[model samples]
Target: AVPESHRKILADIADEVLEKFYGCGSTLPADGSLEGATVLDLGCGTGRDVYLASKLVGEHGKVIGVDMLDNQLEVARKYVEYHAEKFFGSPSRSNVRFLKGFIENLATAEPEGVPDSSVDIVISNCVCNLSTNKLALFKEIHRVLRDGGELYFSDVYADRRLSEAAQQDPILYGECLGGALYLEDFRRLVAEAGFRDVRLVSVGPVDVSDPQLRKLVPDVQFYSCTFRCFKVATLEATREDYGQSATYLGGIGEEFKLDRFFTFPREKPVRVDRNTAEIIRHSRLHQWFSVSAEQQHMGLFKANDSYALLHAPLSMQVEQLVSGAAA
Candidate 1:
């Protein structure tokens, strides 16, 4: 959200004070499938989740954090090491990144240096309501998502709208109250954002200390609902006729589903037909591409981009496909 003449004023304030630093309902599921993922933490204040997510995704994955406040970015960046140690044990990794940007629009280097359709997961704290243009934020999310990308977030919610008096209170918003969306309306917002499979994964009640404020918002109850929306399949969207099929080089199948898998990162080069490439390119999971080679390199055998692809260089691919046998 913008503050007009006071945008600078907000930036000048300390990050500790600027962020709406509260989380609602924590039924947030740990889908445990986040290894090697490119996750974007929206409204990432001081990167509390950013670093945590970095560990979950491991060294092969990246975490992109976007925030509007420069002060918060500074504070968050300063603690990259601190958070890493606090969350990640032993030798910590620098996989967490923070960038100054607004949710309304995005581009490379503004957030975590990547282009559109480049992230696997989107997670947010209790901050999306503060956006000046909620619709723009939704559209931008869709723009950067590959087909299967889903939103797993936690935020505040209410039964009804608050008047200007309550809505303008910074303390209340920070407490995750002022801008809390109506519960049902929150579900509708997902529809507006083009997400279809909205479901109530969980719900919870709110707790407050301010007697007056608590009484005024007695109906407020927040939910940590996680929902999903698939734009299209990576194989089906961008390619034609090619079916979904892949062969594992070596014992790779031990870490995947069948010879081929669905969740492999974009940076990992797999031999797929023209149709499969279309799907991988279009799938939201391909966002924030990753390289999943068990060893150091993906060991790709280049294919000529033209029909003179007369030689699929991976012709030895069949040999590499053998599992458990010495290559």
Candidate 2:
């Protein structure tokens, strides 16, 4: 119905994606210092945010949009390319691009093209709420952003879960339930995935006055809101500067603690590369962290040397709150 965002793709693709519109972060009215930024719009339905954000990031900035649904991506490409021509003069030479993928598959982490620590902002409107695994979803976002970059998104929130039947229905999923994140669960997710301050930006009313949805979720009162989660330095109340001996407690001789994913015992020494002493955590199972902290001095910046291990498989490794003798 609306191809305002597509330009290069044929009509066939446009017809397939116009009906997709659901969101959670409606509070994101401010494009927030968007010039020359590299942005990723996750689950970029119909490419609306892709095109909209392109204008804000301006001619020099780069934008990437990803969606799990092929049909939606078809529309997104056409619409995005369409606007690229409109704004860029010819063929929309806009910096916007699209990918066909699912958010759970470590989207940007995939080598296909998404670069790690290569992006600035990630905006998703009502899409993160639709992912089956919140853990994988945030992990992917964390993998892609530069340190201190943010994931700004809108998604559906529920005080309670929908019934089994409602949760299983494709229509309901499209209605934004099959993958919705519970309010408490959302809090747990970003924290565990490597974010400390997940800021709420805006809130909007969910007037699901549609008779069908109201009947299905009679007890459900849904909220649509925007959120901004940053990947940055999560320092303890007490940060100990180890001079040159600082290093990550990778839970071996390191004995890293990961129960909260962001907190640590202040007594542990963190070494820098005679540079930045920030901790970057990563995992093959479910853990992922970034080390981009650099307290600058004298026109020079320091870089972190080693990344401590976080989130070892409990089935395989024991949890530790205290440092082992080797560290």
Candidate 1: residue 227 lDDT (0-100)? 36
TM-score for every candidate vs. truth? 0.58, 0.62
Tens-place lDDT per residue, model 1, 1-327, is 221422433343335533634444331234335777788888887765676566567668888888888877777787666545544553356677777887777774473554777877787877776765666777778778766665667665665666677777777776667767665555456557766433233334455778877765665544333333444433221112233333332222233321111333223444444433433345432433332322222222233242122122211111122223342
In model 2, which regions exceed 4 Å deviation?
A: 1-32, 79-81, 106-111, 163-166, 235-327
The whole-model C-alpha lDDT of candidate 2 against the native structure comes to 0.57
Query: Which candidate's lDDT is highest?
Result: 2
* Tens digits of lDDT, candidate 2, 1-327: 122322322232334343564445342334134667787888787776677677667689987888777777777777766667666675657798888777766433332657678777777877776777788889888888887577777777765667888788788787776567556567677778887545444443465767887777787756665666667665322233434433333332224332222222334553433222332332111122234344433221122321232213211111132223453
**What is the Cα-based TM-score of model 2?**
0.62
RMSD for all candidates, in order, please: 16.0, 14.1
